[PDB]
Write a protein that binds this ligand. Structure first.
Ligand code: NA
Ligand SMILES: [Zn+2]
Ligand SMILES: [Zn+2]
Ligand SMILES: [Zn+2]
Ligand SMILES: [Zn+2]
Length: 81
């Protein structure tokens, strides 16, 4: 479990991803949630930043990722870095 939000980089009160082997953690506000998830929750690294479909290409520095239809510099990283 990472100790800093994968979206914003800072620490504090973080929620953890339930996908198998995902160590990524997030603030609620950085995800657009007001309360902790109420069942199995998968974090945004796993789904396309455009359409929400399962992602195939992944930023290693933040949860931006894209599916085949919508997919970066070089580990690969997106614009924010
Ligand atoms: Na994503
Ligand atoms: Zn955050
Ligand atoms: Zn995850
Ligand atoms: Zn997509
Ligand atoms: Zn990124």
């Amino acid at each position: 479990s990472e100790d800093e939000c994968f979206r914003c980089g800072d620490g504090g009160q973080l929620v953890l991803c339930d996908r198998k082997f995902c160590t990524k953690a997030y603030h609620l506000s950085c995800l657009g949630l007001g309360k902790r998830p109420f069942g199995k929750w998968e974090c945004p690294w796993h789904h396309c930043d455009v359409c929400g479909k399962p992602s195939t290409s992944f930023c290693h520095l933040c949860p931006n990722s894209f599916c085949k239809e919508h997919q970066f510099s070089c580990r690969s990283y997106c614009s924010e870095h």
